[PDB]
């Protein structure tokens, strides 16, 4: 049947919230009040892919937009990207792995790690309004930890 979807926001252990900066790039910043109409809504998709209990693979598109955070080399790296899709075919249970996080419930959060690159996790730095990026290390400056908000 089709894919399954639901629209959520996320926030960083730290408690800040993601908003777009620029059209590729999302980062998180310190949100209360009138401005949290300024974060992104996510539709995460359940996806195909290896699962567990605790594991569960997803995609991550922005709410209405033919948009999709990627997992892609560059200048030789694992790196984090928004990426355009045809919106006549997405989102699809079968997604590309670029596309696929593995949704970790860890100690009342959840981690994102990239199905493509084991590893390398959806990150936050401490600092404010500094990009979301794809970081391969737990336990040090970078966040790696997010609640979920389910929206309407």
Known sequence: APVRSLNCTLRDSQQKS???????????????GQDMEQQVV?????????????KIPVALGLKEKNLYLSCVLKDDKPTLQLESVD??????????????????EINNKLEFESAQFPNWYISTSQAENMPVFLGGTKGGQDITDFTMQFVS
């Not at 993601?18 to 209360?32: C, D, F, I, N, R």
């Open 18 to 32: 993601l908003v777009m900066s620029g059209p590729y790039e999302l980062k998180a910043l310190h949100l209360q």
């Open 42 to 54: 996510f539709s995460m998709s359940f996806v195909q892919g290896e699962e567990s209990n605790d």
């Open 87 to 104: 919106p006549k075919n997405y989102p699809k249970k079968k997604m590309e792995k670029r596309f696929v996080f593995n949704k970790i």
